[PDB]
Enzyme design. Structure first.
Site, PDB file in Angstrom:
ATOM      1  N   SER A  18      77.455  19.848 -23.200  1.00 36.40           N
ATOM      2  CA  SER A  18      78.355  20.068 -24.324  1.00 36.40           C
ATOM      3  C   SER A  18      77.593  20.617 -25.523  1.00 36.40           C
ATOM      4  CB  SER A  18      79.057  18.767 -24.700  1.00 36.40           C
ATOM      5  OG  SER A  18      78.131  17.694 -24.706  1.00 36.40           O
ATOM      6  N   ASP A 131      71.029   6.773 -19.200  1.00 34.61           N
ATOM      7  CA  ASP A 131      71.878   7.638 -18.393  1.00 34.61           C
ATOM      8  C   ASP A 131      71.216   8.090 -17.084  1.00 34.61           C
ATOM      9  OD1 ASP A 131      74.266   8.815 -17.830  1.00 34.61           O
ATOM     10  OD2 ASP A 131      73.896  10.635 -19.013  1.00 34.61           O
ATOM     11  N   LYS A 133      70.467   8.901 -13.405  1.00 32.78           N
ATOM     12  CA  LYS A 133      71.309   9.302 -12.274  1.00 32.78           C
ATOM     13  C   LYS A 133      70.627  10.408 -11.481  1.00 32.78           C
ATOM     14  CE  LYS A 133      73.963  11.946 -15.682  1.00 32.78           C
ATOM     15  NZ  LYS A 133      75.238  12.633 -16.024  1.00 32.78           N
ATOM     16  N   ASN A 136      69.911  13.610 -13.160  1.00 35.77           N
ATOM     17  CA  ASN A 136      68.801  13.537 -14.108  1.00 35.77           C
ATOM     18  C   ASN A 136      67.423  13.364 -13.474  1.00 35.77           C
ATOM     19  OD1 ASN A 136      70.093  13.887 -16.522  1.00 35.77           O
ATOM     20  ND2 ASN A 136      70.596  11.704 -16.754  1.00 35.77           N
ATOM     21  N   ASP A 149      66.359  14.689 -19.411  1.00 35.29           N
ATOM     22  CA  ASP A 149      67.565  14.427 -20.198  1.00 35.29           C
ATOM     23  C   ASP A 149      67.476  13.176 -21.062  1.00 35.29           C
ATOM     24  OD1 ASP A 149      69.979  14.847 -21.303  1.00 35.29           O
ATOM     25  OD2 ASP A 149      71.167  14.591 -19.460  1.00 35.29           O
ATOM     26  N   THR A 162      77.140   7.800 -17.850  1.00 38.73           N
ATOM     27  CA  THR A 162      78.033   8.308 -16.820  1.00 38.73           C
ATOM     28  C   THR A 162      78.728   7.124 -16.150  1.00 38.73           C
ATOM     29  OG1 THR A 162      76.641  10.253 -16.429  1.00 38.73           O
ATOM     30  CG2 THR A 162      78.239   9.703 -14.726  1.00 38.73           C
TER      31      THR A 162
HETATM   32  C1  LIG Z   1      67.107  24.282  -7.071  1.00 39.48           C
HETATM   33  O1  LIG Z   1      66.137  24.863  -7.944  1.00 39.48           O
HETATM   34  C2  LIG Z   1      66.717  25.279  -9.183  1.00 39.48           C
HETATM   35  C3  LIG Z   1      66.071  24.473 -10.303  1.00 39.48           C
HETATM   36  O2  LIG Z   1      67.086  23.791 -11.029  1.00 39.48           O
HETATM   37  C4  LIG Z   1      66.774  23.119 -12.178  1.00 39.48           C
HETATM   38  C5  LIG Z   1      65.485  22.987 -12.693  1.00 39.48           C
HETATM   39  C6  LIG Z   1      65.226  22.292 -13.860  1.00 39.48           C
HETATM   40  N1  LIG Z   1      63.950  22.229 -14.255  1.00 39.48           N
HETATM   41  C7  LIG Z   1      63.680  21.562 -15.390  1.00 39.48           C
HETATM   42  C8  LIG Z   1      64.629  20.921 -16.184  1.00 39.48           C
HETATM   43  C9  LIG Z   1      64.299  20.235 -17.360  1.00 39.48           C
HETATM   44  N2  LIG Z   1      62.998  20.124 -17.810  1.00 39.48           N
HETATM   45  N3  LIG Z   1      65.223  19.619 -18.120  1.00 39.48           N
HETATM   46  C10 LIG Z   1      66.523  19.673 -17.740  1.00 39.48           C
HETATM   47  N4  LIG Z   1      67.468  19.031 -18.595  1.00 39.48           N
HETATM   48  C11 LIG Z   1      68.792  18.688 -18.384  1.00 39.48           C
HETATM   49  C12 LIG Z   1      69.223  18.093 -19.557  1.00 39.48           C
HETATM   50  N5  LIG Z   1      68.224  18.054 -20.493  1.00 39.48           N
HETATM   51  C13 LIG Z   1      67.193  18.620 -19.892  1.00 39.48           C
HETATM   52  C14 LIG Z   1      66.934  20.338 -16.585  1.00 39.48           C
HETATM   53  C15 LIG Z   1      65.975  20.986 -15.775  1.00 39.48           C
HETATM   54  C16 LIG Z   1      66.285  21.701 -14.570  1.00 39.48           C
HETATM   55  C17 LIG Z   1      67.591  21.835 -14.043  1.00 39.48           C
HETATM   56  C18 LIG Z   1      67.851  22.536 -12.867  1.00 39.48           C
HETATM   57  O3  LIG Z   1      69.105  22.683 -12.332  1.00 39.48           O
HETATM   58  C19 LIG Z   1      70.006  21.584 -12.417  1.00 39.48           C
END
Ligand SMILES: COCCOc1cc2ncc3c(N)nc(-n4ccnc4)cc3c2cc1OC
Length: 276
Positions: A18, A131, A133, A136, A149, A162
């Site tokens: 959001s 949170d 899960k 995360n 997160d 959640t």
């Molecule tokens: C399947 O391969 C694709 C890789 O997909 C991802 C790699 C990520 N790699 C790193 C993050 C990171 N450091 N923080 C967050 N995040 C979510 C809220 N606040 C932070 C999120 C990701 C993150 C999310 C991803 O998709 C859901």
């Protein structure tokens, strides 16, 4: 030394919230991939999220553990905040739960153990996630976990996370403690083994009903030692969950029979079991 948006080649969107969008970005000078979290200042101010964003950055600065995201850098332009985060190549744990249906015992044990160590570290610093899960809990290229997160986190000297992972005390006292993360841990274990979260229902309200009534069931094939552990986490009284300080902390929890074969001291140097 501040970095700038021009310093990067931005690529695909990794996730949207959001108040934020996470974008994969390749820094030009180094070839390095970061997951850059972008947040629009106006929308943060409008919705009174300033304390939540500040707390998220502050908490992340203090994380120095291989099982947690790392904050490498921050900058901002006129409209936006940027947080440079570690990139988790293999994405959400949730994706693997769905691809393979459920984890065998070796995998459940190994990944649970990593979540436990991560929580031990986190709670050691008086930080509560609030949170936790599979969404995360990310997996990086080595298949070790990376928990992310921190926008809902609380630092110990209001929220609800959640629905499926919310603890009873939050639906009751509107309260939250290290135990709340442990409740969530109980649900995640259940989910790794069963394939689904423990408390399911048509809507938020019905889910909350089951939670306060401790209304859920174990499948018969559920690993016995894993079930016993879950029953000692999914406990209505937050004061009696394995792991909480009233139960004398992480020692007894790590000593649980399910973790019998686990070597706790160097988890992130061990090669994770192949997920099949
Ligand atoms: C399947 O391969 C694709 C890789 O997909 C991802 C790699 C990520 N790699 C790193 C993050 C990171 N450091 N923080 C967050 N995040 C979510 C809220 N606040 C932070 C999120 C990701 C993150 C999310 C991803 O998709 C859901």
């Amino acid at each position: 030394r501040k970095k700038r948006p021009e310093d990067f080649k931005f690529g695909k969107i990794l996730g949207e919230g959001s108040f934020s969008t996470v974008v994969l970005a390749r820094e030009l000078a180094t070839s390095r991939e970061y997951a850059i979290k972008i947040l629009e200042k106006r929308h943060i101010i409008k919705e009174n999220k300033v304390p939540y964003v500040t707390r998220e950055r502050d908490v992340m600065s203090r994380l120095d553990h291989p099982f947690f995201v790392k904050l490498y850098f921050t900058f901002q332009d006129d409209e936006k905040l940027y947080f440079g985060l570690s990139y988790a190549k293999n994405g959400e744990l949730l994706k693997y739960i769905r691809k393979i249906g459920s984890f065998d015992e070796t995998c459940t044990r190994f990944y649970t153990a990593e979540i436990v160590s991560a929580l031990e570290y986190l709670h050691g610093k008086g930080i509560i996630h609030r949170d936790l899960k599979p969404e995360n809990i990310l997996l990086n290229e080595d298949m070790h976990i990376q928990i992310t997160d921190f926008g809902t986190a609380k630092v110990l000297s209001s929220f609800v996370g959640t629905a499926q992972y919310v603890s009873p005390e939050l639906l009751t006292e509107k309260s939250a403690c290290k135990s709340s993360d442990l409740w969530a841990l109980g649900c995640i274990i259940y989910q790794l083994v069963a394939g689904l979260p423990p408390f399911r229902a048509g809507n938020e309200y019905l889910i909350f009903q089951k939670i306060i009534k401790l209304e859920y069931d174990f499948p018969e094939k559920f690993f016995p030692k894993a079930r016993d552990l879950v029953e000692k986490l999914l406990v209505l009284d937050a004061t009696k969950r394995l792991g909480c300080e009233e139960m004398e902390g992480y020692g007894p929890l790590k000593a649980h029979p399910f973790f019998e074969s686990v070597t706790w001291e160097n988890l992130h140097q061990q090669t994770p079991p192949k997920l099949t």
